[PDB]
Nucleic acid binder design. Structure first.
Lengths: 131, 165, 224, 199
RNA sequence: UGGGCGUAAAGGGCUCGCAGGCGGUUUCUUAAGUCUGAUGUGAAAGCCCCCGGCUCAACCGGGGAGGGUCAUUGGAAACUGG
């Protein structure tokens, strides 16, 4: 029953990849907009734009698509989940899908990519992996 | 893909062969079934399932069927670029990148198609059903799944080869 | 290049049978039948025009599939005008895929055609030549289009992909690009160069195959 | 343990003249035993594994546990596995001895080491398996310089390995540098020998 | 980490509900969990790393590494908790 908005947004983007619609809407949160900005930096998605309406919402996300068909992301998963806490020391963080994939790791400094996290040497909760 | 050209001869090493029987009124007709796979050891691999009453006919049908299809099989640093999981027919298989000295590590026929890949090293493990056919179809569906990280980097405008490795 | 006036009577076709995936091609509902968006037709026919213009320089052969009633009548005249090979009635299985067996078929046609005049007649007993003659009559209709081809086509035309979805599946089984008109009940994904327009009308196939045959005759006109 | 059989027959089991290289094989092209006139049958994969390992083994004559020891100790080493493994096999004293041309075959060279004919850094070493540190000298020792067999070995000429150097006038030579894999050309694959020990 | 439960073993007959588990968004605060530095200890031997010594090896030794929901203390506020 709406147990976690972020995992919900992840099944939103994965189903969106499955249905190949140009865009979809999600309810607002700064936690959501920040990591969405991280995906905006990674470039897997073309654009994200919020549209205010009382109270929360509503962000509209535009999926990017390749020049030669093919899904831009071959996989996406949220290792973190309620009822099973997870933690990661700064040196312990995996480099998923080797050099292509990037971690989405919330830290005390904020959400960070695994490269930026390795540079900052800052540990934190691992929100999700995208590849 | 695009397309599937077949312009290079191969030794065409065999992976499996087995007799098969079918009941018919007045007896039991026999037909053989043999799987054979092709690979140039230049990063191209294909598969061929050929059944026939006669063994040369079966292996040659497997040859033409192997000729019918090929896989791009990406290979960065003389090894598969990234780890993958591949279930098929309740036949999962895991593959991982390995150190150059590690050598090829797999089951039989999947080691055969990997030798056809020409790759000098690999981690691999069978899961679920042990039958060779689904192991080959899954391993090669996984090879088809494989793509260079540099290729995906070409697909989008970020930077060439982000993370080191 | 096709003009809008040529599209002026060709608007609309199927309803109820429509595939959702082609909804982008659809403009709006009316009465019952959906109306196709004409501008998108102008774009796809434009790209098809540049593409067909590109094939003529290659010298590549093209197939003209045709099976349906009140549509097959046009492709015959358009093919006789183009000089290109064609299909009059129902497509036979494996004519594209089997290749060599069909080559044996046209070889048999060429053989019996020689049997008509070399003097095979008035030698064999009459019942046998009467049987083989009717068999040749069975040959000429199905093979009248096969007589002009031997190599696998660089591309193939189709009057209705849903009728030919298995043959289209064969061309996809190969690597051959597929030009062809597409209805709302048909799936666009099977055809790399769709032509969203009606086909059940004789004029519907007629004008499109006319503009295509004109583009081919014009592109081939340079020769040299 | 080691030697006790024909050994030449073992090379016949290989089908390859290594080692070698002086085995003729051509004198009896057929495989050893009654089945040799008949066409060869393809070996089972694991049987090909053991055949490959054994094929690498006969040139050295090394014991199973010792060869396995050099193996896993080589694998413990960082870097290329087959390179460190082959150079570990090449680090053995008796291999440097036979490659130095002191003997027609490695086994008698091991016997000459067992006699202690061969000094290391001017010091006698009766153990064939002794590790070869770079820059160490290898000689016939002054007491043993005069022997008909040793001179019979010295009189024969052969091309020197790049990693070693030698002078017959001094009857002495040394291990100048660690061998490259490119320098040696074993008939055996190394990916296959590392393949055998999968676990 | 690393399996399931339509028909192979396997969804409780159904429901009400304590304990328990989980739980929308905005803002501030707290620093429990968490992240990080420093300190104390986690014996030696042994395992691992680089070397030395019994003729090599086993065996033996030098330094380093390794190992705690560990303890003490200074910070980080995004997440979870108050």
């Amino acid at each position: 029953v709406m147990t976690d908005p972020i995992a919900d947004m992840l099944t939103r983007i994965r189903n969106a990849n499955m249905v190949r619609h140009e865009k979809l809407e999600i309810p607002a949160s700064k936690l959501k907009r920040e990591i969405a900005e991280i995906l905006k930096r990674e470039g897997f998605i073309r654009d994200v734009e919020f549209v205010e309406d009382s109270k929360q919402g509503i962000i509209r996300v535009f999926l990017k698509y390749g020049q030669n068909n093919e899904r831009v992301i071959t996989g996406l998963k949220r290792i973190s989940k309620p009822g099973l806490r997870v933690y990661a020391k700064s040196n312990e963080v995996p480099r998923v899908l080797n050099g292509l994939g990037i971690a989405i790791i919330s830290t005390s400094q904020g959400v960070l990519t695994d490269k930026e996290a390795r540079a900052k040497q800052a540990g934190g909760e691992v929100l999700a992996y995208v590849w | 893909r695009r397309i599937d050209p077949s312009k290079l001869e191969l030794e065409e090493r065999l992976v499996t062969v087995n007799r098969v029987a079918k009941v018919v009124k007045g007896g039991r007709r026999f037909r053989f079934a043999a799987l054979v796979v092709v690979g140039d050891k230049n990063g191209h691999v294909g598969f061929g399932t050929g059944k026939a009453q006669e063994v040369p006919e079966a292996i040659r049908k497997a040859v033409e069927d192997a000729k019918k299809n090929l896989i791009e099989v990406p290979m960065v640093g003389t090894t598969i670029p990234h780890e993958i999981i591949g279930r098929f027919g309740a036949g999962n298989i895991l593959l991982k990148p390995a150190s150059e000295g590690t050598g090829v590590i797999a089951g039989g026929p999947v080691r055969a198609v990997l030798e056809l890949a020409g790759v000098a090293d690999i981690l691999s493990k069978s899961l679920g059903s042990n039958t060779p056919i689904n192991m080959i179809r899954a391993t090669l569906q996984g090879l088809s799944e494989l793509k260079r990280a540099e290729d995906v980097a070409k697909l989008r405008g970020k930077s060439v080869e982000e993370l080191l490795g | 290049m096709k003009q809008l006036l040529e599209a002026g009577v060709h608007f609309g076709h199927q309803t109820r049978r429509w595939n959702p995936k082609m909804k982008r091609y659809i403009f709006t509902e009316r009465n019952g039948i959906y109306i196709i968006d004409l501008q998108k037709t102008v774009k796809k026919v434009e790209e098809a025009y540049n593409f067909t213009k590109n094939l003529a320089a290659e010298g590549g052969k093209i197939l003209f599939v045709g099976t349906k009633k009140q549509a097959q009548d046009s492709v015959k005249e358009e093919a006789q005008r183009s000089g290109m090979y064609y299909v009059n009635q129902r497509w036979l299985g494996g004519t594209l895929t089997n290749f060599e067996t069909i080559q044996k078929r046209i070889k048999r046609l060429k053989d019996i055609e020689k049997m008509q005049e070399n003097g095979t007649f008035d030698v064999l007993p009459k019942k046998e030549v009467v049987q083989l003659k009717k068999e040749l009559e069975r040959l000429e209709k199905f093979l009248g289009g096969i007589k002009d081809m031997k190599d696998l086509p660089d591309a193939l035309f189709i009057i209705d992909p849903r009728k030919e979805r298995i043959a289209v599946a064969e061309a996809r089984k190969l690597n051959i690009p597929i030009i062809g008109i597409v209805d709302t009940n048909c799936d666009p994904d099977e055809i790399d160069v769709v032509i969203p327009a009606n086909d059940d009308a004789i004029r519907a196939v007629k004008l499109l195959t006319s503009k295509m045959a004109d583009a081919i005759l014009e592109a081939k006109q340079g020769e040299e | 343990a080691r030697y006790t059989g024909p050994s030449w027959k073992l090379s016949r089991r290989l089908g390859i003249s290594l080692s070698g290289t002086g085995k003729e094989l051509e004198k009896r092209p057929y495989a050893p035993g009654p089945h040799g006139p008949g066409q060869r049958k393809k070996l089972s994969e694991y049987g090909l594994q053991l055949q490959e390992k054994q094929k690498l083994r006969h040139m050295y004559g090394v014991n199973e546990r010792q060869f396995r020891t050099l193996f896993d100790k080589a694998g413990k080493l960082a870097g290329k596995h087959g390179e460190n493994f082959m150079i570990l096999l090449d680090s053995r004293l008796d291999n440097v001895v036979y490659k130095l041309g002191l003997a027609r075959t490695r086994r008698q060279a091991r016997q000459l080491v067992n006699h202690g004919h061969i000094l290391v850094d001017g010091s006698r070493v009766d153990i064939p398996s002794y590790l070869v540190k770079p820059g160490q000298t290898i000689g016939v020792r002054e007491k043993s310089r005069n022997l008909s067999i040793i001179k019979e070995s010295v009189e024969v000429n052969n091309f020197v390995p790049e990693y070693l150097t030698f002078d017959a006038e001094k009857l002495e030579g040394t291990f100048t540098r660690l061998p490259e894999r490119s320098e040696l050309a074993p008939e055996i694959n190394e990916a296959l020998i590392v393949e055998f020990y999968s676990r």
